[PDB]
Design a protein around this ligand. Sequence first.
Ligand code: 9PX
Ligand code: 9PX
Ligand code: 9PX
Ligand code: 9PX
Lengths: 327, 327, 327, 327
Amino acid sequence: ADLERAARDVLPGEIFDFLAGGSGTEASLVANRTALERVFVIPRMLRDLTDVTTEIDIFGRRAALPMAVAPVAYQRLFHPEGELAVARAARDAGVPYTICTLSSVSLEEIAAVGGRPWFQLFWLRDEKRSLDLVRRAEDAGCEAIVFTVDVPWMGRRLRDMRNGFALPEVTAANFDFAPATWESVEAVRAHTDLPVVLKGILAVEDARRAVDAGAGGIVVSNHGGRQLDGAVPGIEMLGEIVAAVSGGCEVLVDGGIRSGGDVLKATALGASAVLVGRPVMWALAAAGQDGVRQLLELLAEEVRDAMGLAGCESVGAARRLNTKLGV
Amino acid sequence: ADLERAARDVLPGEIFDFLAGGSGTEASLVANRTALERVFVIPRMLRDLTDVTTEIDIFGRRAALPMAVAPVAYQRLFHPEGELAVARAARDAGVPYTICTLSSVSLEEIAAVGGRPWFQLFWLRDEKRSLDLVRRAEDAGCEAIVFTVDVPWMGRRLRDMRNGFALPEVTAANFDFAPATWESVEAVRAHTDLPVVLKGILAVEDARRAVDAGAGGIVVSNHGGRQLDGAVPGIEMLGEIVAAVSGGCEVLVDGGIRSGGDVLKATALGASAVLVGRPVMWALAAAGQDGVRQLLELLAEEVRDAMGLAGCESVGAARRLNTKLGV
Amino acid sequence: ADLERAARDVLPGEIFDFLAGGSGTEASLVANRTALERVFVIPRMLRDLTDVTTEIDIFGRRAALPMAVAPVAYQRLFHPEGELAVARAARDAGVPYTICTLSSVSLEEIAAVGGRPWFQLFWLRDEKRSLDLVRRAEDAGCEAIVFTVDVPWMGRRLRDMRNGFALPEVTAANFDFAPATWESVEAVRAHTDLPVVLKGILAVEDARRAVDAGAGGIVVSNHGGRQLDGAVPGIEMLGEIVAAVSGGCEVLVDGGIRSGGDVLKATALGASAVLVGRPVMWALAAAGQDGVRQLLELLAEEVRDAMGLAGCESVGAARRLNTKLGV
Amino acid sequence: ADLERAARDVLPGEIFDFLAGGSGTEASLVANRTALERVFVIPRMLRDLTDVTTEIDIFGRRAALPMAVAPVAYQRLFHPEGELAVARAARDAGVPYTICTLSSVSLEEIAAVGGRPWFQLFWLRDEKRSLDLVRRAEDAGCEAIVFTVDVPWMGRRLRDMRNGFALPEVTAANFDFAPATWESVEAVRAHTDLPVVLKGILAVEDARRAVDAGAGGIVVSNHGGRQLDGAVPGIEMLGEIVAAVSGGCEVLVDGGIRSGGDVLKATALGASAVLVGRPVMWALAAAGQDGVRQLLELLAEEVRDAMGLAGCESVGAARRLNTKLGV
Ligand SMILES: COC(=O)OO[C@@]12Nc3cc(C)c(C)cc3N(C[C@H](O)[C@H](O)[C@H](O)COP(=O)(O)O)C1=NC(=O)NC2=O
Ligand SMILES: COC(=O)OO[C@@]12Nc3cc(C)c(C)cc3N(C[C@H](O)[C@H](O)[C@H](O)COP(=O)(O)O)C1=NC(=O)NC2=O
Ligand SMILES: COC(=O)OO[C@@]12Nc3cc(C)c(C)cc3N(C[C@H](O)[C@H](O)[C@H](O)COP(=O)(O)O)C1=NC(=O)NC2=O
Ligand SMILES: COC(=O)OO[C@@]12Nc3cc(C)c(C)cc3N(C[C@H](O)[C@H](O)[C@H](O)COP(=O)(O)O)C1=NC(=O)NC2=O
C-alpha cells in the first residue's frame, strides 16, 4: 500500500518500471484494479467470532493466510538479499513462497530457508531440462509445481522497450525456453507426485480441462497485466471458473490484491487463496526481510479484521459470502 | 449541505477527520453517495396535495419527518453543549434523537430533554452491564433500543491512525466491549418491552432473521463507510431487504443522506425513515442548538418540497413511487 | 450550441443563471444531457432520399420540423422584443411557438404575429380565471393548450436563492396560482375544443391516464431539471411511455435537445416532436429575431442532415429507427 | 500509435484536423475507441503455437494479415508520393490497399504498383459514369469493389467548417455525386464479376439484405465517426451482424483499430478482417513509404504476438475466442 513510494525513491527508474509495468497500453494492468474496486461484499452480522482464524489447508499443508507470495523473477534487482529475504519473511509469516525459475538465487538455497516453498516452472525447449528442474524442486522439498502456462513468450513491455532495460551484472542462478502445451502439463504430472498448479488460466474451459488434466490447482490470472494486453482480469473470471471446477481443484487468483479487504473480496468470489506480487517487492526494496515481514504482518491483520467485520470466523465462511457489483 | 465548510473551519483537523472519515480506502464511504446519485425518482403528477404531510408513525409514536438523528459518539467533540444541544433541536423539530452508548453526556440527562429519544447499545463483555444499560435507557423513557450489530470491533480508520487521534480531556459519561451475536439480541429482546432495532444489517437473510428474532426494526447501513471497507452501501440493499421483510419490521436506511431529495429516494426504495449522522454534527459544530434546529427546519422544507413535486401527499405514497437507476 | 457564449456575455449574471439553472444540486438538469449522450442511433443505408422531408402533422397542422419552441417565461428578460421576436422567427420557420402564461407580452399580441401558437397554462387558484385564460387563448387563435402539470409549486432554484434574484421593472402581461389535479385537466378539456397537452409527464401510468383523460398529447419532461431534483430525465422514460400510449396521443419530449442529431435520437425513441427551450433564448439574447431565425434555420439543416445520414426520408421513418445504449 | 505526434508536427493544422476529425460533436469518433477499450479477450492457454500464421483468404486471395488499408481520400495531402507510397508499402506487406474514388493519383497508376488493390466507389449522379469507374477498376486488375453506402452526402465536419478548409492546388485524379440505393448496388453487381463489398453497414437487417443483394462482403463501420454523429460504433454491432449473416459474406469492421490487440478483439467479435485508416496516414505523413512499411511491419508483429498470447495459431481460431465487456 504505502511502501510503493519508498520503493520508487530507492529503486532505479528502469527497475521500478520493470516491476510496475504491464504489456501494451497496460489495459489489463489497470483493469485488475478497476475490477476489484467494483466488487462489494455483503457482510453477515452477529455470528460467533470467538476464534476467528485466517488459516487454510492447501496442497496438504496449513497456511497462516489464504495467500502466497507470487513468483517474481530476479528479486536481487530489488534488494541485495533478493529471494532469500522474501522466503525467510514468508516462512516466518506461515505463508507459501513461490520460487521462480528465473530466481537470482538458486532454488535449492531458497528452499533451504524452510517454510513451504512452491516452485514456478517455465517450460524449456528441452522436455529433459524442464523435467530435471521439476526434479530439483521436488528433491529440494518444494510442495507444489506452479506451472506458468500464459507465457509461450514474453508479452511486449513498452516501458522496458522505451528504457532499453536489461539485466545488469543479477543472474538466473538456476542455470549453468519453449511454449508449454497440454502435453507438457501431462509430462510434468507424470514426473512428479507434487500437486501441479497451472498459473495463467482465464477461460472456463481451460479451468475444466486443467482439472481433467490432473492439476491440483489453478491460478486465475492475467499475469498482472504483463502478457496479453486486453486479457480479461482474473477476478472477472473467478466466479465462473469456481462454479465450473466444482471443487475439483484449488482455485487461486492474483492481480491487484492490495489489502486485506481485497483478499476478502477474492475469497467471497470463491478463491481458495490469492497470490500477491508487486507489493511484496515494494516491501523488499523498502526494508529487506523486515520490510516483507511487516507487510505480511499488516496483511494478516487486515485479513483478520475484514473477515470479522464480514461475520466470517473462517476462510470457508468467507467463501460463502455474497457480493454485489457496483460503480 | 453548506455547513460542512463552517464545520471544517471551526473544528480542529483531527476532529473533523474523525467525523468525516471512513475505514480503509473509504470505498464504502464514497459508495454511499455514488449509490444515491444513481437513483432517479419517477414522480407522479396531478394528485391532490391539499394536505401534504411528512409525518410517520414509528415505534408507536408520531414523528414530524421520516427521519431520526443517527447515533454519533462524543458530541462534545463538536460543541460544548454536545448531545444536549442536538437532543433539544431534535425534540423541537419532532424528530427522534438516538442517544449513544458513548455519549459525552449521560443518557438520563439527554433523555430528560424530552422528545422521544432512542438509545443505541454497544454490547459490553458483561451481559449484565449490557442489560443494565438497556434498563437505564428504558427507565429513562427511551422509546427504542437501537442495537448496533456491525461493530464486533472498530474498523480501521486510517485518518485517525495517521493523525494519532485520541479523545482529549470529553468522556464516556455513561460509565463509572464484546462482539454481539444473535444470542445477545435475544437477551436484549427478553429484557425489554421496547422495540429492538438492529443497526448495521446489509444481508437479506440477516434482515429476515432479524424479524424472526423479534426485532421491531432494522437499519440498513454500512455504518457510514466506517466499518468494513468494501461493504455494500445500505441503499443498494434496501429494496431487496424491504421485499424480504414484507412489512414484518420497520426498515430504516442511513449513509449519505444529504437532502430532502435523498430522503425521498430512500423512501421510494421502501425505507420507513432515514438516519442522518454527519450533517447534524456539521450544524452542531457550526452554530450549536440553533444550527441543528435550522438544519432540521431546512430538511423538513426540502422533504415536503420533494414529496409534493413527486405527487405524494404522504410518506406512504412516497414509498409507492418507482425509481430508475441511471448514471 | 455556440450561442451560449454570446448569451452569457451580453446577459446579466443573475439573468443567465435564471435561464441556465436547475433545482437543487441540478442532478436532473445534467442527467438530461447525459441520458441523450448515451443514446446511439442505428442508421439505415441505401434508401431513397430523393425527397427527404422534416415535416410532421401535429394537432391538425403541418409543422416544418418535429419541433416547437418550449414555453419559457418572461422573454423580455433576454431581449427587448422578448416573446414577439421569438414568435416571429418561429412563424417564419414553420415551427409552433408556445406562449407562456407568464409571458412578458400579452398572449393576444403574440398570437397576432400569426404562425400557429400554442398556449401554456399554469393553473390559478380560481378555476374561473384559469378557464378564462384558456378561452382567451382559444379566442386568440391558439392551436393547443399546453397544460403544465409538474408545477404544483416552483422547485427550489439554488442559483436564484444565492443571487437573491427578482424580476426587475418585465411584467406578467397576461394579468391585470394553485396545484393542478386530474379534475383541473377535465375542466380544461370540457371547456375547449383545442387539443390539451399535458407537459411534465414522467410516469408510464400518468401517460396512460392522460390518454384516458382525453389529452391530445403529452410532453415527457422533467421541466429542464427545474422542478424535482432527482426526477428521471424524460428521454429515459420516452420509449416506455410511447409503447404504453400505443398511438393514443402525441408524445413530445424535451430536456437537453441541443442539435439535429438529438432531435433524431428523440424521434428514434418514439417522440412525435421535441420542445427546445434554453437554446432559443440564447439565440434571442444574442441577436434578437434574426438570431432565433438563424438557430431554427441551422436546426432545420441539422435535422435534415441527420435524417438522411440515417436513411430516413420522413420523420415517420426516423421513429422506426433502432437505438443502442452506450457509454 | 506513436506516429500521430510526428504527423501533427509536420502537417498543417487544417490538414491534420481534416484527417483526425469527425462530424458534429465527434460523439461517434470517440465512441469507436471507447467501445474497443471496453472489450476484453478471454485467452486460451497451452495450445500448439508451432506455426502461428496471421494469414487469411479473402475474396479469393491470400492476405498476410486480417487487415486492409482503408480508403482515405486525397493522400497527397499528407505526403508528395501520396497513394503510390501507401500502395507500395501495402503490396510489400501482403495487405490489400483500397484505392479511393477521390484519390490524388489515378486508379490505374495505383493499381500498376501491383499487390491486390481494392477500389472504393462513390456513386455518381450518372449510373453510366459510376459503372464506367467500376469497369476501369476491374480492367486495372482491382480485386474488389468497396461500394461506400453511408455517404448519400458528406456529414457536417465542424473542424473543416471552422478552419474554412479547402483542397489546395491535390486533385481528384480519376476525373476529367448522388446517393446510392439498393438499385445502385444491383447495378454494380450486375456489371462486375468482382466481389462487391458494402462499406458503412450498421443495421443487422442491412447486413442481411446485403447478403441477399449478392454482396461478397460488408464493412461494419460508422465511417470513422465522420458521417452520422451519434451513429453506433461498428464494433458494437459487429457480433450481432456476424451472427445474422451466418457466413453468407465476409464481415469487416473498421473504426479506431490502433494496435494488434485491437485486431484480435475485432476478430474475436467475429470480423473477417479490419480496415485501418488514420494510422496509415500518420505513418505516410511521418516517413512516406518507409513509414507505412514500418507501421505494417509493427502491426504484423503485434497481431502475431496478440494471437499467440491468446492461444490462437490461426485467425480462424481467433474468431472462436470469447470476449467479456468491462469498464
Ligand atoms: C518478467 O515476468 C516474467 O519473466 O515472468 O513473470 C513472473 N515474474 C514477474 C516479474 C515481475 C516483475 C512481476 C511484476 C510479475 C511477474 N509475474 C507475475 C506474478 O506472478 C503475478 O501474476 C502478478 O504479479 C500478480 O499481480 P500483482 O503484482 O500482485 O498485482 C510472474 N509470474 C510468473 O508466473 N513468472 C514470473 O517470472
Ligand atoms: C466511532 O464510531 C463509533 O464509535 O461507532 O459509530 C457511531 N458513532 C459514529 C461516530 C461518527 C463520528 C460517525 C461519523 C458515525 C458514527 N456512527 C454511524 C452513524 O450512526 C450512521 O450510521 C452514519 O453516520 C450515517 O451516515 P451519514 O453520517 O449520515 O452519512 C455510529 N453508529 C453507531 O451505531 N454507533 C456509533 O457510535
Ligand atoms: C421559471 O420556470 C417557470 O416559471 O416555469 O417553467 C417554464 N418557464 C421556463 C423558464 C426558463 C427560464 C426555463 C429554462 C425553462 C422553463 N420551462 C421549461 C421549458 O418549457 C422546457 O421544459 C425546458 O426548458 C426544456 O429543456 P431545455 O431548456 O431545452 O434543455 C417552463 N416550462 C413551463 O411549462 N412553463 C414555464 O414557465
Ligand atoms: C472525407 O471523407 C470522404 O470524402 O469519404 O471518406 C473516406 N475518406 C476518408 C478520408 C479521411 C481523411 C478519413 C479519416 C476517413 C475517410 N474514410 C473512412 C475510412 O475509410 C474508414 O472508415 C475510417 O477512417 C476507419 O477508421 P479509422 O481512421 O481507422 O479510425 C473514407 N471512407 C470511404 O469509404 N471513402 C472515403 O473517401
